[PDB]
Paper text:
Calbindin-D28K is a major calcium-buffering cytoplasmic protein that is expressed at particularly high levels in the central nervous system (CNS) and absorptive epithelium (gut and kidney; Schmidt, 2012). Not only does calbindin-D28K act as a buffer for calcium ions, but it has also been shown to interact with multiple protein targets to modulate their function or catalytic activity. Calbindin-D28K has a primary structure of 261 amino acids (molecular mass of ∼30 kDa) and is encoded by the CALB1 gene.
Here, we report the first X-ray structure of calbindin-D28K, allowing the first detailed high-resolution analysis of its calcium-binding properties. In contrast, the EF3 motif utilizes an interaction at Glu119 (position 9) instead of a water molecule to complete the coordination of calcium. Calcium binding at the N-terminal EF-hand (EF1) motif (where the electron density is more disordered) appears to be more flexible that in the other calcium-binding loops. Calcium SAD at long wavelength demonstrated that the N-terminal EF-hands are particularly flexible and possesses two calcium-binding conformations. Nevertheless, the N-terminal flexibility still manifests as structural disorder, with higher temperature-factor values in this region. It was not possible to build the two conformations into the electron density, and only one calcium-binding site is visible in the final structure. Here, we demonstrate that Asp24 and Asp26 are involved in calcium binding. Compared with the existing NMR model of calbindin-D28K, the X-ray structure is less compact, with the intramolecular distances increased by several ångströms across the molecule.
Residue numbers in the entry: -2 to 65, 72 to 258
Write the structure that this text describes.
């Protein structure tokens, strides 16, 4: 359990289940990030643990302690995480927002608007096979279960776009700025109808640009008109060949 983290920080190599217990030990509010007292507790306990183990700090541990709000992905690279689990965070599909949006569309194969366990399993299996690793069904089931528990913020047993997007670095995750912009179904449906200006049933890139300019204007504290081109490019990656249907735009704007 999370109490075992003190023992885990002394390990030569940390299993995915151990990394999960470390995360839950320090993340006292379950917010998905270590900050303030939680981060200070990690810095103190990581150094005390390697000392108790009679070990030196690895180069990544030295660089982390020297330069310290950090998330789950950053912690996985600092610690001696087991190889096949750490490989799941060294994907260009989780480093570029545009490539992550294409990955979401690729792996939501039942068009449910969520990534369910079996879809997440297929994504992780494909990442491992791309790295030439032979997948063991038991460990893959364990990795999938732990990745879901780490990122399923609302505990509904599946991932929504904003949950899985937290695998991205803070700078690429534009969805953090769209948090308080999300609308209910009725209001969203009214906006979709307004912004489909030619009335052909979908929103194209020119129509999305008008939408994004209007959203920037009404949410000055959250969005930035100078990043419209990036917002446009990220959102167009969820489209069906340049066509944003109601369910595609709902992923970004509907609560
Ligand atoms: Ca926290
Ligand atoms: Ca799905
Ligand atoms: Ca969820
Ligand atoms: Ca249209």
């Amino acid at each position: 359990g999370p109490h075992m983290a003190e023992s885990h920080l002394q390990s030569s190599l940390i299993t995915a289940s151990q990394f999960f217990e470390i995360w839950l030990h320090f993340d006292a509010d379950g917010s998905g990030y270590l900050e303030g007292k939680e981060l200070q507790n990690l810095i103190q306990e990581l150094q005390q643990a390697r000392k108790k183990a009679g070990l030196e700090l690895s180069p990544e541990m030295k660089t982390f302690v020297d330069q310290y709000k950090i998330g789950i992905v950053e912690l996985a690279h600092v610690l001696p995480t087991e190889e096949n689990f750490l490989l799941l965070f060294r994907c260009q599909q989780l480093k570029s927002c545009e490539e992550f949006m294409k990955t979401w569309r690729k792996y939501d194969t039942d068009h449910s608007g969520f990534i369910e366990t079996e879809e997440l399993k297929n994504f992780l299996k494909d990442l491992l096979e791309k790295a030439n690793k032979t997948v063991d069904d038991t460990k893959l089931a364990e990795y999938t279960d732990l990745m879901l528990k780490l990122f399923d913020s609302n505990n509904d047993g599946k991932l929504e776009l904003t949950e899985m997007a937290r695998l991205l670095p803070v700078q690429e995750n534009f969805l953090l700025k769209f948090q308080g912009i999300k609308m209910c179904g009725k209001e969203f449906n009214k906006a979709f109808e307004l912004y489909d200006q030619d009335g052909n049933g979908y929103i194209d890139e020119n129509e999305l640009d008008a939408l994004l300019k209007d959203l920037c204007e009404k949410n000055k504290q959250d969005l930035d008109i100078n990043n419209i081109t990036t917002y446009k490019k990220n959102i167009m990656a969820l489209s069906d060949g340049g066509k944003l249907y109601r369910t595609d735009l709902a992923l970004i704007l509907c609560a």
